[PDB]
Amino acid sequence: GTIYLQHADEEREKTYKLAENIDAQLKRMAQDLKDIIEHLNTSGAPADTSDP
Amino acid sequence: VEEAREQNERNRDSGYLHLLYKRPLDPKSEAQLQEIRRLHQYVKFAVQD
Amino acid sequence: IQGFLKNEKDNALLSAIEESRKRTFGMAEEYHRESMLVEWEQVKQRIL
Amino acid sequence: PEDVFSKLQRENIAIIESYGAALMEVVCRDACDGHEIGRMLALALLDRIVSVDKQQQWLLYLSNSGYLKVLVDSLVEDDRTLQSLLTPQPPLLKALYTYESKMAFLTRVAKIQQGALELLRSGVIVRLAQCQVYDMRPETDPQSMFGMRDPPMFIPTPVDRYRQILLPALQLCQVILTSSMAQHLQAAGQVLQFLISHSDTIQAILRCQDVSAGSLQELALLTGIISKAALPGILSELDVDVNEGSLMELQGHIGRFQRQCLGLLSRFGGSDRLRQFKFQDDNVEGDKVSKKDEIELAMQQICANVMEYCQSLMLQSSPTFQHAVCLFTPSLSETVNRDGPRQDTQAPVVPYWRLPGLGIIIYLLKQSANDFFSYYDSHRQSVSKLQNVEQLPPDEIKELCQSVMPAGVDKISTAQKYVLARRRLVKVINNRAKLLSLCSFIIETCLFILWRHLEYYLLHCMPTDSQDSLFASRTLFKSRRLQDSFASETNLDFRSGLAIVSQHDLDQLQADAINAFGESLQKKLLDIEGLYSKVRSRYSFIQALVRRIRGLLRISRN
Amino acid sequence: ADASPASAGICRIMGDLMRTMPILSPGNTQTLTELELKWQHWHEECERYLQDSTFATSPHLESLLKIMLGDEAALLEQKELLSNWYHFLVTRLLYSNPTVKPIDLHYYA
Amino acid sequence: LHSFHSELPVLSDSERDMKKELQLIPDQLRHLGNAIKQVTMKKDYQQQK
């Protein structure tokens, strides 16, 4: 209820929001890489179980 | 709950506040930084591989 | 001959370095001890 | 008469003097800027000039020209290479060898008081407190002790490459604190800042459970560095803008180093030094004798350096005997509880936060007043063997040879073997004389610290059972907020960390000191003063302390 | 303070805060982390006098305290006293980031 | 646990040395995301070929 926001808290949230945006951009770059790799490994797999 | 309970009692000690300048990162802020370092290195290697 | 008269010349350079270093590093302990003992050799006079 | 080695060095330094500033540029510039091996040899050459210069002409060139700072600020670019040499397979040891010679030249300059001051004026301690390689400590695996038996490879281990990096840096700090005598508190302030820039690495040395000649050498430098820079008066004599928080962290580090170094007196000044040697004297035969002279030495070095630090605290803490700092609790039990044999229930490791008992100092006093008589007749035998080397058994001449050259001894000449035997016997004589001088100090300082605790506890300590104290406390620890204005002493009162002393602990300390300082010890101390103190100016100093302790141990509280 | 014995006592609190500010001195053997930890105490002391409402008797001195605390709103209330944006940048670095590096600087500019 | 940490009155040295590191990563992420684009345009090219 009874506190005035200090300049240090605003800088702390601005540092942790920078870390959150970079975590969320790294996990996206990693999923894009994983999707590219999944596609690279599925293209190697020929679909026809009629082949001896 | 006990991590939060102890943390809440420490936050009332007027002798604790002057030591905070030299505090390490908290073990979640350091862990999110260790994961960001791990993910950056993976995203760097996987682009090469 | 040119292998032997290299290998013992590189051994010789390293030995001239080795005694310089180690005889100055052991003198570091010996200098600590003799200064340590000589300040105690002041403190005992002040006491007595 | 002057020996020919006193003459030939005078005339050679007068020849080297005669070339002047051109020769000084040619060597000092090549020490800074030359080839890998050029810088290396030029630094060993400066180490050798500075070991015959008595005028300080080369130091005054090296300072005024600037080169002595270039050879210090480069340490922060050596670090970057030395970090690579701690990898399991180092690319080339060349950089370690140039660093070991740079550091040897600094450890030469620092033995002249003016040279050590010119190194505090370049800022060498602050540059060492910028090198990360001292915190690059390899992890020593305790499961590896079933992993093969391997040959002496031409590349040292990462753990011993780390010793070739750390031990020169520790020795420079220790040498600067022994040429910079008790005036230059800034020297002690800088070396204290270096111990704190590596703070929990320094404590991980103080927590190393290894008992190798290497871990004991790491400890025997570090304790002898701590003895002169962890001192209270430095915290009154560092007048600069320092924040209340950074100063309370500085005290928080000193109040970590103090207590963890006291934890070595219970480890090695204490009853389980007699455990540690059995794990070495049992298992590994082929190297036992060569290394036991070094392990017995480094153990008493660590004892002496912590007794030097305790003595220093018991000289700075107050001029007034009533406000003397006690470091040892009134428990003498540590001298009593061994005269009956039982099985090895694990001794519960003493928390290094606890103060040791005064019984550890009586146990250490008793043990150096035994070790001294082993060492005395050992030195007197090693000198007898040095006086008769060509009469020794051909197999003992071979043990002495293998204690220096663990290979090739059956390929060297009779003269080469006699010269090795003379040179090992000198190393043993000097290590054993070094050990007698340590046992001498530890006996005299055990008696000083014992006299001071006994003088305090009988005559100036009030037992806490004094019920009138029920009015002395209850009014400060209740919350207020804000305002205003300055001007008092913030003193954190370390007397709140002292022990609750009863009159029973004072009665027990008296009853026990009377028996534990019984005249069988008092005779041996006077027998040692009868043998050794004839070599020193202050014959009767041990007698003067034994007399004052015998005086205290005859007072009764009435 | 010489002309106005009513404000003079408060003008000298402002003036002595203008003497406790940790500015770097080129002849002085300190670290950046020493300057930083000093300046953090000075900021925690300046803001203390704002909570105390010490300057709420002269709004000019109340503005000077906000400016000296790096208040980006009070600094923009001074825009008619900041003839260009790069003086505003250097003011904002003096009162909000005294340990700024070349590799941070673009973002502040 | 996140509300019991938001009430600290000054930044620690480690909260500033994390910020110095977090401010660097966006310019490495630019070069890393460009390396993903370069490798995807390499994959697109090889696959179309």
CA–CA separation, D307 and F12 (whole Å): 38
Beta bridge partners of D382: none
A4–E51 C-beta distance less than 8 A? yes
Q: Do A33 and B47 touch (CB under 8 A)?
A: yes
Give the integer Cα–Cα distance in Å for D465 and D68: 62
Cα–Cα distance, D32 to E61 (Å, whole number): 56
Q: Any idea which residue has 């010789």 for tokens?
A: C12
Using CB atoms within 10 Å of the CB of residue D306, give its burial: 0 to 12 exposed, 13 to 18 middle, 19+ buried. Answer: buried
Q: Which two tokens stand for residue D105?
A: 């030249």
Q: Contact, D158 vs D96, CB < 8 A? A: no
- Residues of D in Cβ contact (< 8 Å) with E40: 243
**Residue from the list C25, C39, C41 with its beta carbon closest to the beta carbon of D168:** C25
Q: Are B33 and F18 in contact (CB under 8 A)?
A: yes
Q: Which amino acid is at A15?
A: T
Assess contact for D308 and C36: CB atoms under 8 A: yes
> Chain B partners of D243 at a C-beta cutoff of 8 Å?
21
CA nearest to D53, candidates D24, D96, D84: D24
Query: CB-based contact (8 Å) between A5 and chain E?
Result: no
Backbone angle region of D42, left / alpha / beta, with phi > 0 → left and psi within -120 to 50 → alpha: alpha
Contacting residues of B for F32, CB less than 8 Å apart: 40, 43-44, 47
Q: What is the DSSP letter of D355?
A: P
**Angle CA D308–D310–D311, to nearest 5:** 60
Q: How far apart are CA D422 and CA D410, in angstroms?
A: 18
Question: Cβ of E90: how many Cβ atoms within 10 Å?
Answer: 12
Determine the Cα–Cα distance for residues D222 and D192; give it in Å rounded to an integer.
11
Interface of A with E in 6-45 (CB under 8 A): 6-7
> Three-state SS across D346-393?
CCCCCCCCCCCECHHHHHHHHHHHHHHHHHHHHHHHHHHHHCCHHHCC
Picking from A16, A22, A30, the nearest residue to B42 by CB comes out as: A30
**CB count, 10 Å around CB of D45?**
19
Q: How far apart are CA D254 and CA D264, in angstroms?
A: 16
Tell me which chain A residues have a C-beta less than 8 angstroms from the C-beta of E43. 7
Specify the experimental method. cryo-EM
Task: Provide DSSP, D398-465.
Answer: HHHHHTT-SS-GGGS-HHHHHHHHHHHHHHHHHHHHHHHHHHHHHHHHHHHHHHHHHHHHHHTPPPTT
Q: Do B43 and A33 touch (CB under 8 A)?
A: yes
- Collapsing DSSP to helix, strand or coil, D357 comes out as strand
Residue D283, class by beta-carbon neighbours within 10 Å (0-12 exposed, 13-18 middle, 19+ buried)? exposed
SS (HEC) of D213-253 = HHHHHHHHHHHHHHHHHCCHHHHCCCCCCCCHHHHHHHHHH
Give A-chain residues touching F33 at CB under 8 angstroms: 29
Q: Is the omega angle on the peptide bond into residue D484 within 30 degrees of 0, that is, cis?
A: yes
Mutual angle of helices D288-316 and D359-386, in 10-degree steps: 130
Given B7, B20, B44, which is nearest F4 (Cβ)? B7
The DSSP letter of residue D329 is B
Asked if residue D37 lies in contact with residue D94, where contact means CB atoms within 8 angstroms, the answer is yes
Strand partners for D357: D329
Give the helix/strand (H/E) hosting C28.
Answer: helix C4-47
Q: Do chains A and B touch (3 or more CB pairs under 8 A)?
A: yes
Residue C41 and residue D538: Cβ atoms within 8 Å?
A: yes
Token pair of B8, please?
A: 């809440």
Distance CA D31, CA D52 (A): 19
Chain F residue closest to B33 (CA)? Answer: F18
Chain A residues within 8 Å of chain F (Cβ atoms) = 3, 6, 8-9, 11-13, 15, 18-19, 22, 25-26, 29, 32-33, 36, 40
User: CA D193 to CA D187: how far, in whole Å?
Assistant: 10
For D51, the token pair is 């070991």
Tokens of E59: 């709004």
D vs B contact (3+ beta-carbon pairs below 8 A): yes
Q: Which token pair is D510?
A: 């008296």
CA distance D49 to D42: 10
d(C-alpha A27, C-alpha B39), whole Å? 7
Task: Dig out the tokens for D245 from the structure.
Answer: 């928080």
Burial D218-234 (b: 16+ CB within 10 A, else e): bbbbbbbbbbbbbbeeb
Whether F contacts A, i.e. 3 or more CB pairs less than 8 A apart, is yes
> CA-CA distance, D210 to D205, in Å (whole number)?
10
Give how far E3 is from chain A: nearest CA, Å: 36
Question: Which residues of A are less than 8 Å from B40 in CB distance?
Answer: 26
> Which two structure tokens, joined as six digits, stand for D319?
């001029």
Single-letter amino acid, residue D132: Q
Interface mutation target, options E39, E40, E47, E50, chain A, most CBs of A under 10 Å: E47
Residues of chain B contacting D244 with CB distance shorter than 8 Å: 18
Q: After which residues is chain E broken (C to N over 2.5 A)?
A: none
Q: By the CB < 8 Å criterion, does E47 face chain A?
A: yes
CA D155 to chain centre: 28
Looking up tokens 């480690």, which residue turns up? F14
Using an 8 Å Cβ cutoff, are E95 and E21 in contact? Answer: no
Distance CA F20, CA E101 (A): 9
User: Which tokens in the block code for residue D372?
Assistant: 């001294």
Q: Which of D124, D301, D316, D165 is nearest to D229 (CA)?
A: D316
Distance from the Cα of B1 to chain A's closest Cα (Å) equals: 23
Taking the CA of residue D529 as centre, how many other CA atoms within 13 Å lie in the half-sphere pointing to its CB?
19
Which candidate, D260, D138, D262, D246, places its Cα nearest to that of D200? D260
With an 8 Å Cβ cutoff, are B19 and D244 in contact?
no
Question: Would you state the structure tokens that stand for residue F37, as one six-digit string?
Answer: 């684009």
Residues of E in contact with D483 (CB under 8 A): 52
> D498 in helix, strand or coil?
coil
Helix (H, G, I), strand (E, B) or coil at E83: coil
Torsion of Cα atoms, D328 then D332 then D334 then D338, to 10°:
170
CA distances from C27 to B11, D23, D51 (A): 53, 27, 12
Distance from CA of A48 to the nearest CA of F (A): 21
End-to-end Cα distance, chain B: 44
Q: What are phi and psi of D357, to 5 degrees?
A: -80, 160
Residues of chain F found within 8 Å of residue A11, distances taken between Cβ atoms: 11, 19
